[PDB]
Design a protein around this ligand. Structure first.
Ligand SMILES: Nc1ncnc2c1ncn2[C@@H]1O[C@H](COP(=O)(O)OP(=O)(O)OP(=O)(O)O)[C@@H](O)[C@H]1O
Ligand SMILES: Nc1ncnc2c1ncn2[C@@H]1O[C@H](COP(=O)(O)OP(=O)(O)OP(=O)(O)O)[C@@H](O)[C@H]1O
Ligand SMILES: Cc1cn([C@H]2C[C@H](O)[C@@H](COP(=O)(O)OP(=O)(O)OP(=O)(O)O)O2)c(=O)[nH]c1=O
Ligand SMILES: Cc1cn([C@H]2C[C@H](O)[C@@H](COP(=O)(O)OP(=O)(O)OP(=O)(O)O)O2)c(=O)[nH]c1=O
Ligand SMILES: [Mg+2]
Ligand SMILES: [Mg+2]
Lengths: 683, 12, 683, 12
């Protein structure tokens, strides 16, 4: 057993009835001194290292060619001047096992944390040395963490795409289904997760060219997609992961849900495809009143009205569909369907829940389209337009797919440095650069939507960590007050940066004029309401930082009306799992699952205490399974009111909880304005 | 543990 | 129990020690008088019936509009002038349950046999009333039978494609694999069987973009294809059928064969995909000498030589591949592989066996390409060129994909009418019309190859029926003598018709100049050898018909040299599964499986004696399982010397035959020039 | 049943 691993395992060995938390610093120091320094390649100078990395097909020479070697040396010195030290063994282990560049044989280490940070900053700056230094300071201070794809692949010749989340609309035709399979395989080949909307596919038993009962429904396409994702499993290094979304009013909803039953037959069972359900307010209203509900055949609706069922307003068109003899529908029990969803989530954690009306009542780009589904992580909520892929030698009608490149603010580090504005603006710049340099040449809708909408996702992490290290309970009203103020500030500064970028480039996103930003309806609550902390304790946390007021929001509204917005979507809180160890932070805005994380790496078990965990803050590091999910919903709803996209919201359930408790949590989240529910985790 | 909704879980 | 079923079931009730074969005429008479005449939609005259059929979207008006109604009436009168009577219950039952046009509710019969034949003749003639009458006489005499797709769909608005056999080349890339899946689904949607060549795909454990052990091999692509064919099930009435072919020297050959093992894991099993193996002479030579053989990784060969492994001559390149260090190969036992093939064919009847050198030593279009694989029925053997499907917005490099429309001569009726030449020429004209009227909108390579090659397949059926009804044993030398003479005459007249069509249209098939027809190397054996019957009994069967001599073949060779050839391929003997009942003929050129065919339709069982079966010829109707498979191989090889494409050759094995017997049968077929082996049927 | 192929099985 490695010496550092033995030191780490001493964490759990109680001394004086207390965990030996100081053993992790010794564990990380031993890990470095005994493995990392030994296995780190030696280079006489930075010039030689850069030459070796470029010539040996490790780095892309184009982005490094925009700087004189003096500027590159200055940037690397800026990264190294901080003398950054990993506070725990797990942070350094995760970095040097996942993100640190290694020789082609995976035997030696070519990049340190400073080297990766400097390369990422130089890639972001796009030839600006001062901007590169600012990015280096942001990342080395760990105020901002680029998403795993960007952090790992930026500046590397043999790299996947820096965007890893894609949403695909599928039209009701064989050409569209085949193109969807091809695009999913192409995108999974790039390492990105693919979410597909299957609500426009006709249900099982529908006619194909005036021949009845010919359609296999969404389950056959689901089997096709599951096999496609299994085949394009990223060369075996990471199994292909895809998500399928179906509106609850789709006739195949019960068959769609049954694909995740354990007892499901292997023919119908889908193994590697995640499933989410889009629930309009109409379904919740029907279930609340216990009224018999109907699920519709999409193709009958399309023929009767000329539009897709998910392209129409269900809250208004449900009665018309029920009263239309030319629309085929199946009677269902809405409460039975809700209970089936709860039981399926308890057994497997699926499906994801998207509350469509919660998403679209605040959606700023409803003129472009309503939000119909989410991504594989359930935090992407953007307008999409379905593409029409025609026969060979015909012209395809390319629509708008969804993709956003992610980055996370480190809430603890941002608050400690009092740099919400600067960090948010720099992260927005880096995400804009990543979006601009991204070009998928096998997903026409994805490429077109990336060019037209310029969507980015700026997330946050270490909310529970920051609160616990400041003596604030995650479920307390003070925690919600802090989240309200912090995310209001984040939204304000991201909007300001988007407007500044639009002014500098003299260009907004496609169809901005019809958005709520253009009309000013977006800023109504910000100009009419105040979001400064209501608790003196929280207000003190923001000392030295300007909290935007109603006057500031009015000025920002006027500025946006004058100059517009560059990004259709800016903020989305993704789960941010792997890089949380490197950042030494709690994942996303969710509460911690366990105070100390027990992991197995090889035959050696590693112990990871929650970042900042200690005797004096043990009580504030309350585990998620012990919290009231209603309070977690309150926190997420407080945060979600300042996020234009969704928040990846996992539910942490105890094994004693019945399906009724899960249903109550779902209904409260829908009541509280929650947009999506990611996972039902049971302890 | 399957348990049915009781018409009050829809009100808060 | 219907009266006709009761009469038919009286066949097996032996009276006086002999079967009551005369009950079938009574059975068919009762069937007609009590079901068909009752359930036939009544029209006052042909004009009203045609107007009703065209108005109700039954008959396409494009082909009918080419004729004045007087011409259509004359053609229909010609069809009815024969007073055609179905000789057995099964023929009429098959026609009126599979091919007769029925109302949309499937309750009434709109088409009689004469109406269907007249519609097909009008479709063939393309406005030529005399040509239409000739086609009506040809089909009503049952000398020529259009294939099930052409016969069923011709002249129908709802009709699918008249071509049903498709061969696709798959290039070694994700784009090409996705395009192959899409094209397979598109062609299955049309109801045609799709065969794919997987020999170009790199083996499992090969590198993708300098990333080793990333490729999943041909079995992952096979799983994708199996799911695609399962999804495109053609309404489910006929499940989607696809075949995958792999070269025996491919690395994945063992895994390719393991997909058909019953013991195979379900994640590897491919339920709906038939598998064929392409065996070059090199493999047989290696197994004969018991030498250790190697299976090669295709991508290593492609990188080393810039050409695909299956695009090279293995008999010339095997030693170079073995001696080349840059080529990756693993050792195998050729005799163990042959035994595994025999065991798999005994257990499941798979894989199909294609003897590549047997096919390509007589292939006339080796300049275009060698024949690398076969179709789902194992009789299509044509040159193919793989396509290069590139990224979206990139132009594709469309190759040549194989397809042919099928027709069968009725040997018994062609010999009774002494109309080999006229029947062959009319069948060639009809096949050419079907080829010219085909346009596949989602298979660019299929459509391009159809335009360029103009390949047709003219088969034959009722060989065993004709021989038995003439006192000739199937395995006897006289049977092979008759087959030799008859198929030599068929080849002569099909070549003459192809040359005449080329002269009339002024065009040959693409790349005809480099073919063996152009250089005259095709006619060497015909100008040097006489194919007249060597037995007086056989020579008498051809009395009244002119048997081409060496002088006639010299004249035809000169004529072809002058005018060229319109078709790259003319003759292929397909199984002719269900349309043989309508013609009251034995299936293809294979020997009959049973003397009396017992089948259960609905809840009543029916008996079908072999056509012409009686006490006098009972012994000549020897069943295939009782036949010496060596004599069947001899007969098929005799026929195959006059067929430019392959022949669907099913092996009929007794349960007592060991795997060594099957291996010996395959080795004798390879020795005798057999191109393909279709199925291993065990009694 | 399964029996091996002998050398004479490749000649006719
Ligand atoms: N916790 C840590 N995180 C990251 N790097 C570390 C850590 N501990 C040690 N290192 C690396 O190991 C090197 C040697 O560590 P050590 O504590 O012996 O340094 P030193 O001689 O005291 O000086 P300095 O740390 O300023 O370089 C450090 O320079 C740093 O590169
Ligand atoms: N075996 C058969 N095959 C095809 N059609 C048949 C057959 N038997 C009867 N029919 C159809 O049923 C009609 C009535 O048959 P039936 O034998 O009673 O006729 P018919 O009055 O004796 O004279 P004809 O044989 O000239 O029709 C026939 O005219 C023909 O249309
Ligand atoms: C071809 C085919 C389609 N489908 C389903 C998937 C598609 O969403 C749906 C429509 O297929 P389409 O490709 O649109 O067929 P079509 O356009 O020719 O017929 P229509 O005019 O009615 O649109 O049918 C199957 O389930 N199985 C099949 O084999
Ligand atoms: C993308 C991908 C390809 N493959 C297989 C299918 C193809 O036949 C083969 C080649 O893939 P390609 O799509 O051709 O990959 P590439 O051309 O970018 O890389 P290279 O030039 O090195 O070939 O790899 C997989 O098995 N899994 C995958 O995820
Ligand atoms: Mg359609
Ligand atoms: Mg390639």
């Amino acid at each position: 057993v490695p010496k550092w691993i033995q030191l780490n395992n001493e964490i759990m060995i109680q001394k004086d009835g207390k965990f030996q938390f100081d053993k992790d610093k010794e564990a990380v120091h031993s890990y470095f001194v005994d493995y990392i320094n030994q296995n780190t390649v030696f280079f006489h100078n930075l010039k030689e290292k850069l030459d070796y990395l470029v010539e040996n097909q490790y780095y892309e020479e184009e982005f490094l060619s925009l700087y004189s070697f003096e500027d590159i040396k200055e940037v690397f010195k800026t990264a190294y001047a901080k003398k950054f030290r990993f506070p725990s063994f797990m942070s350094a282990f995760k970095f040097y096992n996942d993100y640190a560049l290694k020789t082609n044989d995976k035997k030696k280490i070519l990049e340190r944390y400073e080297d990766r940070i400097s390369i990422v900053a130089l890639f972001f700056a796009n030839g600006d040395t001062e901007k590169a230094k600012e990015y280096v300071n942001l990342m080395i201070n760990q105020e901002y963490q680029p998403s795993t794809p960007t952090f790992l692949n930026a500046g590397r010749k043999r790299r996947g795409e820096l965007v890893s989340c894609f949403l695909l609309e599928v039209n009701d035709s064989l050409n569209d289904i085949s193109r969807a399979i091809d695009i999913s395989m192409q995108l999974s080949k790039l390492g990105g997760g693919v979410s597909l909307n299957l609500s426009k596919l006709r249900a099982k038993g529908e006619a194909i060219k005036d021949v009845e009962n010919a359609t296999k429904g969404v389950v056959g396409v689901m089997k096709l997609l599951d096999n496609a994702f299994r085949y394009a499993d990223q060369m075996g290094q990471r199994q292909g992961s895809g998500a399928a979304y179906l509106n609850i009013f789709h006739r195949d909803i019960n068959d769609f849900l049954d694909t995740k039953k354990i007892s499901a037959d292997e023919d119908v069972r889908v193994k590697t495809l995640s499933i989410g359900v889009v629930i309009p307010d109409k379904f919740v209203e029907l279930a609340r009143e216990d009224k018999a509900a109907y699920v519709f055949y999409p193709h009958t609706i399309y023929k009767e009205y000329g539009q897709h069922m998910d392209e129409m307003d269900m809250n208004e068109m449900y009665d018309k569909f029920v009263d239309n003899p030319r629309v085929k529908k199946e009677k269902i029990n809405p409460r039975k369907l809700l209970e089936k969803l709860a039981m399926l989530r308890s057994e497997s954690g699926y499906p994801y829940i998207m509350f469509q009306d919660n998403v679209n009542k605040v959606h700023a780009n409803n003129h472009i389209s309503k939000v119909k589904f989410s991504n594989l992580c359930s935090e992407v909520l953007q307008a999409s337009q379905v593409s029409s892929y025609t026969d060979y030698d015909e012209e395809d009608e390319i629509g708008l797919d969804i993709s956003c490149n992610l980055g996370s603010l480190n809430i603890l580090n941002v608050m400690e440095h009092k740099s919400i504005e600067k960090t948010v603006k720099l992260a927005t710049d880096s995400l804009t650069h990543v979006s601009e340099t991204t070009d998928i040449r096998n997903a026409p809708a994805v490429r077109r939507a990336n060019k037209a909408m310029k969507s980015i996702g700026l997330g946050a992490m270490n909310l529970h960590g920051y609160l616990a290290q400041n003596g604030i309970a995650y479920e307390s009203p003070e925690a919600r007050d802090f989240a309200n103020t912090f995310f209001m500030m984040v939204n304000f500064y991201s909007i300001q940066r988007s407007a500044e970028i639009a002014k500098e480039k003299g260009e907004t996103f496609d169809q901005y004029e019809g958005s709520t930003y253009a009309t000013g309806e977006y800023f109504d609550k910000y100009v009419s309401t105040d979001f400064s902390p209501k608790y003196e304790k929280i207000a003190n946390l923001f000392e030295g930082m300007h909290i935007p007021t109603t006057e500031d929001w009015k000025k920002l509204k006027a500025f946006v009306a004058e100059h517009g917005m560059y990004h259709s979507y800016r903020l989305c809180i993704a789960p941010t799992g792997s890089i949380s160890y490197v950042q030494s932070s709690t994942a996303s805005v969710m509460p911690i699952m366990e105070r100390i994380e027990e992991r197995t790496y090889g035959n050696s078990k590693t112990y990871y205490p929650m970042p900042g965990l200690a005797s004096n803050n043990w009580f504030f590091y309350k585990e998620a399974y012990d919290m009231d999910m209603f309070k977690v919903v309150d926190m997420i709803a407080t945060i979600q009111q300042h996020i234009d996209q969704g928040i990846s919201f996992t539910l942490f359930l105890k094994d004693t909880m019945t399906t009724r408790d899960l249903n109550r949590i779902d209904l409260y989240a829908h009541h509280r304005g929650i947009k999506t529910i990611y996972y039902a985790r049971t302890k | 543990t399957v348990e049915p909704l009781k018409d009050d879980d829809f009100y808060f």
